[PDB]
């Protein structure tokens, strides 16, 4: 559902 950089 939405951005991160290793995870939710």
């Amino acid at each position: 559902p939405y951005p991160a950089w290793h995870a939710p």
Epitope: A4, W5, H6, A7, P8
Partner: antibody, heavy 121, light 108 residues
Framework: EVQLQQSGAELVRAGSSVKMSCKAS????????INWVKQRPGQGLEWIGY????????KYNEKFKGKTTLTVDKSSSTAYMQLRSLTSEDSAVYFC??????????????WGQGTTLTVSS | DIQMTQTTSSLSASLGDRVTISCRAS??????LNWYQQKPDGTVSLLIY???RLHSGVPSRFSGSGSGTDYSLTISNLEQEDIATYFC?????????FGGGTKLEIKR
């Protein structure tokens, strides 16, 4: 070496705000992310959020969002974190750290000395 | 999200022993675990990263392991210099979370 010199201790009144620095040195500032961790001297470390210097992208920890704002300036390799509507609960030492990629994730390989923030009148 | 429980707040040992600091994720982290060592003076530095195996230029006597929810930092042949607080951190999901940390002290 890689270095991160954070700001000097800060003294501010609840209701007010503050803006701390994290000046990077010895590496390409835009090739790595800056994370902010708070350590209230209670029980551990908290991940605030973080930012990609080149990207300008920011990802917050739901808790610290709304009152926190991460930014960066790259014509001087510095990153800033601004805290708003301060309260007793924001008295802590704040650290910034570099993020490196590995596997499919990150970890913090270098940190700053830290910035002490005392919210008081 | 995943929260880490370092389940011992203060750990007690003698210079020279094999110290083992643990850390448990409330869910599988596919070995996305890192270890930091904070000193009394306040400064923090990295030790071991990824699944707990990987070294960042440090004494060999620092070793990590673990596999699902259970991990550990093991300082064999302990040393003065090593008396500090150790925090584990999960890098599998957001938000990033650390454990309560474990502080070593000298046994008397």
């Amino acid at each position: 070496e890689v270095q991160l010199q954070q700001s000097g201790a800060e003294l501010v009144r609840a209701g007010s705000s503050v803006k701390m620095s994290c000046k990077a040195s010895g590496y390409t500032f835009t090739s790595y992310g800056i994370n902010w961790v708070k350590q209230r001297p209670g029980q551990g470390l908290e991940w605030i959020g973080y930012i990609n210097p080149g990207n300008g992208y920011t990802k917050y920890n739901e808790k610290f969002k709304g009152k926190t704002t991460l930014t960066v300036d790259k014509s001087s390799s510095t990153a800033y974190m601004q805290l708003r509507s301060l309260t007793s609960e924001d008295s802590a030492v704040y650290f910034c750290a570099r993020s490196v990629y590995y596997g499919g994730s990150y970890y913090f390989d270098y940190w700053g000395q830290g910035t002490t923030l005392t919210v008081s009148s | 999200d995943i929260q880490m429980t370092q389940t011992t707040s203060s750990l007690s040992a003698s210079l020279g022993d094999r110290v083992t600091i643990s850390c448990r994720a409330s869910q599988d982290i596919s070995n996305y675990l890192n270890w930091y060592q904070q000193k009394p003076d306040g400064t923090v530095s990295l030790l071991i990263y990824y699944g707990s195996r990987l070294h960042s230029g440090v004494p060999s006597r620092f070793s990590g392991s673990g596999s699902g929810t259970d991990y550990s930092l093991t300082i064999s042949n302990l040393e003065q210099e090593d008396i500090a607080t150790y925090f584990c951190q999960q890098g599998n999901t957001l938000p990033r979370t650390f454990g309560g940390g474990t502080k070593l002290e000298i046994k008397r």
